């Protein structure tokens with residue numbers, strides 16, 4: 001049973017362009033899974049402490065037959081491969097962040113997983129790249145991505 005998972009990518013440490021390229025190769029190496037498409041690379045000012053570098057943000061469509069937490073096990077390996085240091089606070093810098101934004105049309109609320117990503121509808125740097133690869137996207141609650149964007153004051157992003 002194949003599902004399309006949409007994954008958000010963020011990086012602002014240790015050459016983000018290399019970090020993201022490495023993440024994309026590794027994402028394709030996930031078993032029972034392959035990349036359908038990927039957005040452009042965007043350069044975004046940090047949401048959080050201002051004394052950190054600008055981010056490279058992107059979105060990826062990953063077709064997969066894995067269970068959601070099985071996929072999470074793989075995306076977390078990828079973060080560690082790129083030296084991600086796990087921390088409690090979540091707005092600081094990192095080599096690589098891989099978040100599952102959407103997993104098919106599923107709503108997931110477990111100890112390890114909240115899908116749709118709890119804050120994605122409030123982050124231009126997640127929505128704009130997603131819109132690039134899925135302009136007709138509809139969230140599980142039925143809102144359209146396009147309507148959200150063109151309705152709220154999301155400044156457009158600059159490319160990397």
Ligand SMILES: Nc1ncnc2c1ncn2[C@@H]1O[C@H](COP(=O)(O)CP(=O)(O)OP(=O)(O)O)[C@@H](O)[C@H]1O
Pocket residue numbers: 086087090091097098099100101111112113114115116117118119
């Ligand atoms: N949709 C999702 N994708 C990835 N991880 C998720 C998730 N929902 C919950 N999590 C959980 O979030 C935990 C911490 O992940 P972190 O990457 O350190 C938070 P972050 O991405 O830096 O900030 P954010 O969640 O505000 O985007 C993971 O161990 C994972 O279990």
Ligand SMILES: Nc1[nH]c(=S)nc2[nH]cnc12
Pocket residue numbers: 009010011044045046047048055057090091092097125
């Ligand atoms: N704090 C932040 N974390 C991640 S993963 N991506 C960002 N883009 C702009 N700010 C960001």
Ligand SMILES: [Mg+2]
Pocket residue numbers: 010097098099
């Ligand atoms: Mg994140």
Ligand SMILES: [Mg+2]
Pocket residue numbers: 097098099
């Ligand atoms: Mg994360």
